[PDB]
From Swiss-Prot:
<dbReference type="GO" id="GO:0016231">
    <property type="term" value="F:beta-N-acetylglucosaminidase activity"/>
</dbReference>
<feature type="binding site">
    <location>
        <position position="101"/>
    </location>
    <ligand>
        <name>substrate</name>
    </ligand>
</feature>
<feature type="disulfide bond">
    <location>
        <begin position="6"/>
        <end position="127"/>
    </location>
</feature>
<dbReference type="GO" id="GO:0042742">
    <property type="term" value="P:defense response to bacterium"/>
</dbReference>
<dbReference type="GO" id="GO:0005783">
    <property type="term" value="C:endoplasmic reticulum"/>
</dbReference>
<keyword id="KW-0020">Allergen</keyword>
<feature type="disulfide bond">
    <location>
        <begin position="76"/>
        <end position="94"/>
    </location>
</feature>
<keyword id="KW-0378">Hydrolase</keyword>
<comment type="subunit">
    <text>Monomer.</text>
</comment>
<dbReference type="InterPro" id="IPR019799">
    <property type="entry name" value="Glyco_hydro_22_CS"/>
</dbReference>
<keyword id="KW-0964">Secreted</keyword>
<keyword id="KW-1015">Disulfide bond</keyword>
<dbReference type="GO" id="GO:0005615">
    <property type="term" value="C:extracellular space"/>
</dbReference>
<dbReference type="GO" id="GO:0031640">
    <property type="term" value="P:killing of cells of another organism"/>
</dbReference>
<dbReference type="GO" id="GO:0050830">
    <property type="term" value="P:defense response to Gram-positive bacterium"/>
</dbReference>
<dbReference type="InterPro" id="IPR001916">
    <property type="entry name" value="Glyco_hydro_22"/>
</dbReference>
<dbReference type="GO" id="GO:0042802">
    <property type="term" value="F:identical protein binding"/>
</dbReference>
Length: 129
C-alpha cells in the first residue's frame, strides 16, 4: 500500500507516534517519505547482506528476522515480512523500540540527512488530524 501524506499522518497519530520520545508527527512522516516514499512494500538490500523493510525501512540485522541475515538479532520479534503489510502496526511498534534505543531518530539515515533540523511541520500541514 502506498499511503497518502495525510492518511499516513493520521494512521501514525492513531498509533501513538505523535510526540513519541519527543519527536513530533512531522518527523515520522518525513522519515517515511524519504525512507520508502510512503510505500509499505519497499525493500532495499544493504551491502552487509541485511535488508531494510517497509515504510520506515527497518533493518533485518537487528530488528526483524528474514531468514537470510546471518548472525542478526530479531529485537522486534517479528518476521521482516510483517513490516510490509498495509497495516502499519507492526512497523510502528518496532519503530517505537528503535527510537528508544538511544540514538533517537538518528537511526534512520534519511531522517538524519533530510528531515533533521528542517521544518518538519510542513509534512502535516493541511491534514485533518
Amino acid at each position: 500500500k502506498v499511503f497518502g501524506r495525510c492518511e499516513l499522518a493520521a494512521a501514525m497519530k492513531r498509533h501513538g507516534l505523535d510526540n513519541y520520545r519527543g519527536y513530533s508527527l512531522g518527523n515520522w512522516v518525513c522519515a517515511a517519505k524519504f525512507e520508502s516514499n510512503f510505500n509499505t512494500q519497499a525493500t532495499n538490500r544493504n551491502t552487509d547482506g541485511s535488508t531494510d523493510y517497509g515504510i520506515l525501512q527497518i533493518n533485518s540485522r537487528w530488528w526483524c528476522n528474514d531468514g537470510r541475515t546471518p548472525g542478526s538479532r530479531n529485537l522486534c520479534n517479528i518476521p521482516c515480512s510483517a513490516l510490509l503489510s498495509s497495516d502499519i502496526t507492526a512497523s510502528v511498534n518496532c519503530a517505537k523500540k528503535i527510537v528508544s534505543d538511544g540514538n533517537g531518530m538518528n537511526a534512520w539515515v534519511a531522517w538524519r540527512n533530510r528531515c533533521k533540523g528542517t521544518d518538519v511541520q510542513a509534512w502535516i500541514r493541511g491534514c485533518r488530524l
